[PDB]
Symmetry: C8
């Protein structure tokens, strides 16, 4: 016989900064726009709140919880047996839904992070396979260059600057160096690209993420549950 | 007549991360956006659920299963007991879920198999092109040998290289040029970044493992209810 | 007096991967988006199915086949004289239409491939005409450079690195080499661009395409033709 | 009164590949997308067919030909016999098809002829610009000769070139610079990639061959029916 | 009492190629899309035809000319006193409007070309003023470099390659050359950019344009004026 | 009561080429598209014409002037004679045309004057920045002189230059570095392409000449009629 | 009993050039499009005019001022006791609103400029902190290079061109120079980027802005306040 | 019953410049456009004002506060005296203004604090990557030392450098290479532009100062009126 009401809306951008940051680490340029996250989050609360209303109606002693767009933020209400009771229950049910959806979001985020980590680790591995193939081919090129240097009887380097060399100019390094590059192939480091190090960077960032109760929020109060001064009618 | 209801919606992004990753490996920049994937997946469950509903009508004793926008979707089932309505709704949801998941998994494995084949063929044809380029390079070296012989340059005439062109190859000297020609068969091909990107994508597609965890097509907002009143 | 029904929708992306790949080889960046292909394909089945329904009505003994959007996938139906008969005929007519449209698609794809091949072959030819003109001009430049080298009495090369040369610096290669480059012009390879080799690559890919019954599909079952348990009414 | 009907739709992409290729040669990046071409072509058949219908009304004995959305389009013809309705519908479709194809073919040949002329003119004017650039280069060489004479540099003073500038041309030496000037008339023009792209497009436009296979404007979903009942 | 009708639509792309080309020379990347030109052109005919209809109604003896979208191409009509007369007049009035609008288009195009030519000529002039300022500044730099070379007593060049020089390295060319570059400044050619030569190219193309009766068209017949077989009613 | 009508529409592109060119000089990439300019201009005539109509209502003897879509526009005037209706309509169109043209011309001249001022100020501030950069370069040269003195390098130690850096300036030698410092006052500023683009735009804006031919705001599809009937 | 009317619309682009320029200096690529400024400005006048109408109605002796779209430009009106009075008051009230909104705009612009100046000044400061860190690191690199040069006993430079040096090739400058670069680190200028000088450029432009009564306008007359020839009715 | 009204609209761009600057520091290219910020801010005031209206209804003696489009917005309050209506409307506007401003300020400070933390963590992880790159460089130097020893190159063999590669590092000579290895611990890390951009953003975020002037959420078009009539 007494109705408490509250008005809620999307969480503020500062309050979801943690979640936004995590999404940007995971998805990069494909991460959702913050305004879209805001809509998604309040939407999730809204549908969960509506479901709770159904649960509360499906009782031997039904309870009346409502939610609907304020215009035509969201206006929510609860009908209680007393003014204090209605207010208290509305606050309780808002918190109940909040706790439920936050837990789901946190768990899904941790799942996402774990998968992203595994995928980045796998990507480093396969990128290393490719880099190893490239190194192996370079050693082959050096082996061929040694043939050419041996034919020209070039044992010492003929170039007077540090510079790129290709299959056709490698012989100019001279057979002394070329032989050493071949003999020591096993300890020659791989040539890793900026893209490879971007993968490592992302993996480090993903592993640094910590999902907590502060990471995301799904609503804010425009008006907290009211203590109705008059009974319904 | 007891009615059970449930409320379902699109799967969460974490729950389709495997599928999303696979689509990105297979399609690259043309892979669907995550939000679009979500809509597609719940849509697929939804049409399958409507189809089951109906199938269930086409029985000696027809059953009433429904689905409609409640954002999410509300599904309902009319049973002859409270527990029966709840249990059968849950079972029918799982039945549709299992069916759609199997179809998606098999289609994805098919897609991966074809992608692998296509990438392998691509490496083969790219190698044909790389071979033609090597063959032409050897011809350029053969011509540069003529020029070096005419200038009587047997040893390299350089102090650095800025990169090697048809017109300056002769400066490498006939001793080296002759050796490059003699040993052409053991000269490695010059592969491009695009070739290695093809190899990279092939390694990644072969690394995909499609399991029951790879994709999902719905999540519960509210599980099937046990109706308190008929 | 007995109605069988089925529900069908667009083919899955994995089931049209072959067709999609072929389209990407043929059209490159202009190839249709896979979702658009899906719509096109089911659309083609749909219109062919509707045409069949007209054909079946235009009979001394009319038959009733229907198709329409399920909502407010596509729902199709057939009205038969018995439950088993209706189901069997609906399945038959779906397969009949499927076979017809698949054949059209396959034949059009093979036509497209043949034309693409011819066009790529022609493009290689014309690109070679251009490359030949560029080589011919370079030989002319070398002829002029020989004049300059002869005037400066430069017979041996004056540069100490491999590098690009232009009309004004070609003379620095010296008249011995320049004369040889001119004398041997016929055996000087053409200078082919990355774009030229992209054309060759595409031609190789186009020739590797094989159109089969697995290449494309135009529908999938959401629900296979039903065996109706009750007569109409 | 017997009615025959047919169902037609846009031509297939394979069947307009020739026309599409030609449009791409002529217009490049501004060529219409294939799907747009398809819509344009069936649209052209459609308006021509309506026009024939309406013509056929304007007769001492009016005939009824129609076209409407069936998504595809449904066309119909009312004849005085079953075979007549079918035969005349097929003939009228072919009549319109022949008319539209001839118009498209002639317009495309006109477009190709003008494009050829435009490309040829473009090569001419580009050559005028290339000539002005060569003339200026010779003037730069004439000035560099002055500087080389003042420094008394007759032979080249370099070991490589990095890029050749007005200010460092003199390092090539007066012997070579004088020869470059003396022989200016036989110095080839320096043509750019854009010039060769113009030549490339000209070769390709000249390679186009417009035939009855080049374009199509419809395909049958269902050929004209033989009506079983009046 | 007799109505002749015709159906017309936008001119074909091949028939407006001349106009399209001229517009592309004048406006470059800002030239209208050919489909937009097509719409503009038929639109111009349409409004002129409607105006003629008003002119023909405003007569001591009114005549009835009509135009309207065929569906909800354009359908036009004329009502004459005889079948042959109606057809002949409709054809006449279509040609009359065609001639009028073509003349306007041709004259506006020639006006546009003349203005474009003047603007390009002016642009070459101002670009040359800028290039002259750049040359003047370079001569100043060379004057300063001569000071530095004189202080270091560098009379001969100290660099062994052709290369770019800047204010700080110009002195390495040596005072003999630097003095000559200064003494001969008047005959030093300006350094013109690719953008400058693009302006010259466009000017040459603009001057090559020739506007004729074939340059543009504004309609094509879908159906030529009919000879009505029956009077109205 | 005699009514005269005319049909008018947006000015042609050739007839607003001057105005379009000016807008492009002043605004560059932010200049309005031609088609948008056309719409803007006829729109301006239209509102001015409506205003004249409201003016003409607010008279001891009200006059009726109208404008409406024929999209083109149809304008009309109700006169007391046939010739009067025609003549007054033509005069009122010209009256509005003259008024709008004068406003556009004056506004454009204002815009040009401000643009000139802004470009001149921009050259001044850009020069301040260029001066700061020169001053810093001289400081770098002063430091390089210290390093050259410590290494006792008085003459240049190079054979080419690849860029000149703070750390390799000393290789130019103290004789030259000292001279660069001593003569800093006569060292020209190093101006960028952007600086010269500002100069270019200034020359072009100063070249604009606004005349009665620069812009137009309508064209006649049909001139005011002489009505044959009242 | 007498109504004066006027018609007004958005200010012309030339009349708001000053404001537009200021906005472009402040916001760069994010500055509003001029057409959007035009709409904003007339909109501001419009709402202020409507507010004035409310103020004038809220009087012991109400006055009737109106504004509304001409179709569903803006048409404004005032109802006075005489023809001359109505016209005079309408003109007065238009000017009154004009003065009010112009003052607000000017003050907000000056506020914006002051803040932009402060922000640019702060940005130069922080950019200098970064440049100083980069210089400090370079001095560290030079310190390490001195170690290497000392080990190789390289006191004089070994390179024969001006060029970039890195950590690994700095030693080639020789210990005499390297020691001097270290000893004189305090007087080594910072290495400022083009982005840094763009910040300085913008600051200079911002400081050159002068907001006056000519800077912006918010309306223009299509028709000035009329002197009504007849009373209302 | 006396009604006071006011007309309010979005805050001006100058009045939210602080907030806009902060958003740009924190979000960069993803920062909201100014016009969008304006709409967001007045929207926030508006919903808070509606909420106050309810609050004021839920009283033993209900009060009537309203807000609606006039765009701008018109707000009104019904009081029991003319001065009371005006005064209470002004107070309620200020009350809502104070509440929303405090929320925005606290949220912005929270956002800044998290951004600072995130940037600091980013510098740490970027440094881990830079360290791995340095460690690999030292390994390359260790290998180049082997090659130099084999060629017996102890002193540098170069006249310039074009960058330094694994394959040409040996030309620096074993004396220098050994020293580079011996002194690896004091070799500075090689930081990228992106690293310094992170440092730059951190300095700027730390420079932000959130005050009552940072943001505003409305401006008055018309202040609360003193109604002359009941």
């Amino acid at each position: 016989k007494w109705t408490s009401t509250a008005i809620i809306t999307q969480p503020d951008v500062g309050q979801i900064a943690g979640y936004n940051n995590a999404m940007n680490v995971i998805y990069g340029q494909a991460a959702p726009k913050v305004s879209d996250l805001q809509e998604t989050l309040i939407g999730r609360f809204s549908s969960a709140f509506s479901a709770l209303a159904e649960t509360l109606d499906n009782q031997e002693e039904p309870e009346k919880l409502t939610i609907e767009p304020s215009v035509k933020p969201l206006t929510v209400s609860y009908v209680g047996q007393t003014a204090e009771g209605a207010q208290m229950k509305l606050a309780q049910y808002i918190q109940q839904v909040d706790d439920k959806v936050n837990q789901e979001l946190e768990r899904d985020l941790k799942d996402n992070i774990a998968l992203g980590r595994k995928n980045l680790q796998d990507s480093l591995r396969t990128q290393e396979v490719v880099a190893q193939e490239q190194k192996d081919l370079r050693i082959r090129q050096i082996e061929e260059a040694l043939r050419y240097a041996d034919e020209a009887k070039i044992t010492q380097p003929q170039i007077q600057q540090t510079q790129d060399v290709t299959q056709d100019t490698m012989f100019l390094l001279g057979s002394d160096a070329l032989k050493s590059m071949i003999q020591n192939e096993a300890t020659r480091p791989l040539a890793f690209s900026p893209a490879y190090y971007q993968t490592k960077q992302t993996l480090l960032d993903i592993k640094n993420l910590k999902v907590t109760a502060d990471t995301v929020h799904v609503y804010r109060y425009v008006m907290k549950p009211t203590l109705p001064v008059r009974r319904d009618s």
